[PDB]
Every structure is written in structure tokens, then in C-alpha cells.
Amino acid sequence: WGSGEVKQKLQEFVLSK
Amino acid sequence: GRKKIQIQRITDERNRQVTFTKRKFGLMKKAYELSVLCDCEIALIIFNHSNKLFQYASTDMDKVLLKYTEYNEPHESRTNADIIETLRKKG
Amino acid sequence: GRKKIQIQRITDERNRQVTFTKRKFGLMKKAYELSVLCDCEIALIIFNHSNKLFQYASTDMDKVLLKYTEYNEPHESRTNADIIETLRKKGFN
DNA sequence: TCTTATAAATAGTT
DNA sequence: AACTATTTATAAGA
């Protein structure tokens, strides 16, 4: 939920579908 | 409970909030129990009527979310509509 | 149930599988009920003991996950340790 | 897979 | 903030 790598990876995963 | 209720939106604001707190805990308690009995890892994400966030993970939300991104195989995915259909079938 | 159980790991493989299927449905049903009664949006992610994936969302999983990534305030966050703490403090009710 | 006896969660009142 | 009668969930049976 905050600025970091986990947030970035989840966002990328959802958007790439 | 003292009476059976219909599963429909509660419009009384106090009752909605009381119900939310109680049932949110109940749901997390059932998640804890499933995680221990069946050796699984669980996460819950909840946005309430005000769009405030509440979360639970049996151990670590970071790990659950990262693993979620790696899973490629077909898997079970259900929604409210599916649950309602199962309840019709159950009668 | 026909007999009282305690909350501990099930070692019998068959019983574990049966219990998992039944309690997984029960958990998703409670999520459905909370979502409708209280106007919540809910996602549930479950990895079983072999790390097979099962999911539920009240309406749309992708919407809930993206809202999670957009949230930029402190909020209530619980783990099994918190649940146990609440149980230790609560009454027999 | 469904049913049944019994335990757990909760609706209404306080 | 607690209480309890009842509805709902489920552990073991069919």
C-alpha cells in the first residue's frame, strides 16, 4: 500500500492483464 | 441471532457500524482457524462504505501478494454472484 | 459439529482436504454477507498447504487490488497474533 | 455428496 | 459494553 517494491510489483501484475 | 435477517444493505447507520465491527472480527477468526487447521496462508482486504482500508494476513501480506503475482495456473475464482448461485442450489 | 474440536493442525490428509473445502466455502459466504450488509468491497486470497491458489472478491478482484496499491495512509492491519491477542482478552462471551 | 447432531456466531435488547 | 436465545456453521455419519 506504500512506496516500495511490493506495491510496484502488484500494480504491474494487475495492469499487464 | 435472535431473528433471521435478509442479506441486504443495512441503512441504519449505527446498526451498520456495529454489524461491521462484529462480523469483520468473525471473518478474521474463521480465517485464523482455517490457516491453522489446514496449514494454509490467507489474506483479506476490505474497503468499507467510506473507502477506509482494513487488512488481515495469517503471517505476512507482503509474501502473499508477491506469491499471488507468480501464480500462472488456472485456479478457483469466485464472486458474490457465485455464492448466491450456490445458495440457490443448496436451497 | 458432532464433536468439539480444538484449533490445531489436522494431520490426517483426507480429513484436512474435506475440512478445507467446507470451511473455505464458509469463509467466502461470511465475506459475501459482510459485503452486502455493510456495503464493503472484499478480496480473499488463499494458498493451501501445497501453495495452490483459491480466490474470492465481492465484485471485482482487480479493482480491489489496485485500490490497495493506491491507499497511502496507516490503517487497521491484523495477523494471527492479533487475533489470538483479542481472544485472550475477550470474555467467554 | 448430502444429512444430522452438535458447537459457534450473532441479532436484538440492554 | 454485557447478555442470551436463536440462527447458522460444521464434525462426523450416511
TrEMBL record, chain C:
An example of a GO molecular function for this protein is: DNA-binding transcription factor activity, RNA polymerase II-specific
Tell where it localizes. Answer: Nucleus
The gene designation is MEF2D
For this UniProt record, the keywords arranged alphabetically read as follows: Activator, DNA-binding, Neurogenesis, Nucleus, Transcription, Transcription regulation
Domain MADS-box: where? 1-60
Protein name per the record? MEF2D protein
Q: Name one GO cellular component term.
A: nucleus
Q: Does the keyword Signal apply?
A: no
